[PDB]
Short mmCIF file of all heavy atoms in Angstrom, two decimals:
data_model
loop_
_atom_site.label_atom_id
_atom_site.label_comp_id
_atom_site.label_asym_id
_atom_site.label_seq_id
_atom_site.Cartn_x
_atom_site.Cartn_y
_atom_site.Cartn_z
N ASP U 698 20.03 4.03 71.93
CA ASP U 698 21.28 4.73 71.95
C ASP U 698 22.07 4.63 73.27
O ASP U 698 21.42 4.06 74.38
CB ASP U 698 21.00 6.21 71.84
CG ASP U 698 20.29 6.64 70.54
OD1 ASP U 698 20.31 5.80 69.63
OD2 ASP U 698 19.63 7.61 70.45
N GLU U 699 23.25 4.98 73.28
CA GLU U 699 24.06 4.89 74.56
C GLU U 699 23.54 5.82 75.57
O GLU U 699 23.32 7.00 75.38
CB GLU U 699 25.51 5.28 74.31
CG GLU U 699 26.41 5.39 75.51
CD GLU U 699 27.67 6.26 75.21
OE1 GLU U 699 27.64 6.99 74.31
OE2 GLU U 699 28.61 6.18 76.02
N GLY U 700 23.02 5.17 76.74
CA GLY U 700 22.47 5.87 77.72
C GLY U 700 20.84 5.82 77.95
O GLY U 700 20.30 6.80 78.62
N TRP U 701 20.29 4.96 77.19
CA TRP U 701 18.84 4.81 77.23
C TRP U 701 18.39 3.37 77.30
O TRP U 701 19.20 2.54 76.84
CB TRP U 701 18.20 5.54 76.02
CG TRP U 701 18.45 7.02 75.96
CD1 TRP U 701 19.54 7.66 75.35
CD2 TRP U 701 17.62 8.03 76.56
NE1 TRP U 701 19.44 8.96 75.58
CE2 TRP U 701 18.33 9.29 76.28
CE3 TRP U 701 16.49 8.07 77.20
CZ2 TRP U 701 17.77 10.42 76.71
CZ3 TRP U 701 15.96 9.29 77.70
CH2 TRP U 701 16.56 10.51 77.38
N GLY U 702 17.23 3.08 77.84
CA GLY U 702 16.81 1.70 77.96
C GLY U 702 15.29 1.56 77.74
O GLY U 702 14.68 2.63 77.53
N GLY U 703 14.79 0.38 77.96
CA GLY U 703 13.42 0.10 77.67
C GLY U 703 13.13 -0.39 76.29
O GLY U 703 14.04 -0.19 75.36
N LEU U 704 11.98 -0.96 76.13
CA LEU U 704 11.57 -1.45 74.77
C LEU U 704 11.50 -0.29 73.75
O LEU U 704 11.87 -0.45 72.51
CB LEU U 704 10.33 -2.20 74.79
CG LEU U 704 10.47 -3.44 75.77
CD1 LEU U 704 9.25 -4.30 75.65
CD2 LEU U 704 11.71 -4.20 75.41
N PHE U 705 11.22 0.95 74.24
CA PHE U 705 11.11 2.11 73.35
C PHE U 705 12.22 3.09 73.54
O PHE U 705 12.11 4.24 73.09
CB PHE U 705 9.74 2.77 73.52
CG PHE U 705 8.54 1.87 73.30
CD1 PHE U 705 7.56 1.68 74.15
CD2 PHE U 705 8.54 1.21 72.02
CE1 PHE U 705 6.47 0.90 73.92
CE2 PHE U 705 7.49 0.27 71.73
CZ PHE U 705 6.43 0.22 72.70
N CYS U 706 13.30 2.73 74.21
CA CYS U 706 14.51 3.40 74.44
C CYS U 706 14.11 4.91 74.87
O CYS U 706 14.65 5.83 74.38
CB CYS U 706 15.26 3.48 73.05
SG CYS U 706 15.87 1.81 72.56
N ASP U 707 13.37 4.90 75.88
CA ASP U 707 12.82 6.12 76.39
C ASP U 707 13.10 6.29 77.94
O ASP U 707 12.74 7.27 78.57
CB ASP U 707 11.39 6.40 76.14
CG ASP U 707 10.46 5.33 76.80
OD1 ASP U 707 10.99 4.36 77.41
OD2 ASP U 707 9.24 5.37 76.65
N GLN U 708 13.79 5.25 78.53
CA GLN U 708 14.08 5.35 79.97
C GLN U 708 15.43 5.92 80.12
O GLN U 708 16.47 5.42 79.73
CB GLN U 708 14.13 3.83 80.53
CG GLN U 708 12.69 3.29 80.51
CD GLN U 708 11.63 4.06 81.17
OE1 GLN U 708 11.77 4.40 82.41
NE2 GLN U 708 10.58 4.38 80.49
N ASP U 709 15.54 7.04 80.71
CA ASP U 709 16.79 7.93 80.79
C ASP U 709 17.68 7.20 81.79
O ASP U 709 17.43 7.16 82.99
CB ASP U 709 16.43 9.32 81.26
CG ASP U 709 17.56 10.27 80.95
OD1 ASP U 709 18.73 9.88 80.83
OD2 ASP U 709 17.17 11.49 80.71
N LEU U 710 18.89 6.69 81.32
CA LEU U 710 19.79 5.90 82.16
C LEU U 710 20.88 6.95 82.53
O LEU U 710 21.88 6.43 83.09
CB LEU U 710 20.41 4.79 81.30
CG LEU U 710 19.46 3.80 80.74
CD1 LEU U 710 20.17 2.53 80.24
CD2 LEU U 710 18.44 3.38 81.90
N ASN U 711 20.77 8.23 82.29
CA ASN U 711 21.73 9.22 82.76
C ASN U 711 21.04 10.55 82.80
O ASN U 711 21.54 11.48 81.94
CB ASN U 711 23.01 9.15 82.00
CG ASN U 711 24.19 9.83 82.79
OD1 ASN U 711 23.97 10.52 83.66
ND2 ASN U 711 25.42 9.49 82.36
#
Side-chain angles (χ1 to χ4, degrees):
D698 301 343
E699 176 199 13
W701 298 89
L704 299 189
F705 300 129
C706 298
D707 61 359
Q708 296 304 302
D709 202 331
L710 306 188
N711 201 338

